[PDB]
Amino acid sequence: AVSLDRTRAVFDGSEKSMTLDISNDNKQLPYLAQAWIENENQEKIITGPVIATPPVQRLEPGAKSMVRLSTTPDISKLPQDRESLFYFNLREIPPRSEIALQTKIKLFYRPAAIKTRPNEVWQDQLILNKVSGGYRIENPTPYYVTVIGLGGSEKQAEEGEFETVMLSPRSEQTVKSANYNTPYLSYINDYGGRPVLSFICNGSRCSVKK
Numbered sequence: 001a002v003s004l005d006r007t008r009a010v011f012d013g014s015e016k017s018m019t020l021d022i023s024n025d026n027k028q029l030p031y032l033a034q035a036w037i038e039n040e041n042q043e044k045i046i047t048g049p050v051i052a053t054p055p056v057q058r059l060e061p062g063a064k065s066m067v068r069l070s071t072t073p074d075i076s077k078l079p080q081d082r083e084s085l086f087y088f089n090l091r092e093i094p095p096r097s098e099i100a101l102q103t104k105i106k107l108f109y110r111p112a113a114i115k116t117r118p119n120e121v122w123q124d125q126l127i128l129n130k131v132s133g134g135y136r137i138e139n140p141t142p143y144y145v146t147v148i149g150l151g152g153s154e155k156q157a158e159e160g161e162f163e164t165v166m167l168s169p170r171s172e173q174t175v176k177s178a179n180y181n182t183p184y185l186s187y188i189n190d191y192g193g194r195p196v197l198s199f200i201c202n203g204s205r206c207s208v209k210k
Contacts, residue, residue: 002092017070024059048072128206134177149186157184
């Protein structure tokens with residue numbers, strides 16, 4: 001019943017806070033909406049460096065509210081040349097009645113030093129190294145990157161079976177996979193869209209098509 005305007009959020013470090021819209025899709029019953037932040041190991045944190053306000057609210061049937069995300073000053077202590085990962089959580093509690101689902105989204109703190117132009121695509125810096133078993137995927141960027149498909153074609157990338165892998169900033173991860181002549185890679189962007197990247201290889205090192 002209680003849902004969210006997006007599948008992931010990017011807190012731009014220039015801002016002091018942002019806001020997420022929430023909705024009660026039930027048009028008969030009211031829900032309470034609990035909201036909280038967790039850190040990158042998914043342990044709840046209530047003192048900062050990011051907080052969600054209000055911790056709880058009531059939504060009348062059909063209602064559209066909001067949750068405010070803000071930073072304490074110890075936000076300054078996070079590294080300023082890479083994203084840090086948080087998760088935003090939202091739980092609906094049904095009335096006295098007489099499962100209760102919970103949404104979880106990745107919340108990327110993005111320091112002002114690595115802010116981006118709207119639409120510009122850092123994901124095109126991902127590099128693929130053929131290894132035995134499949135591929136090593138390298139992320140030299142300061143951003144987390146979330147890979148959802150891999151394949152010989154665009155369709156096989158979007159529709160094939162694939163265990164999602166979030167590559168940390170300036171990191172790398174190895175992935176079982178068949179060998180493809182031209183690799184296509186599916187990823188999730190800031191807006192939650194899921195585009196694809198075409199790759200061309202030169203022996204064992206594939207790079208995004210330019």
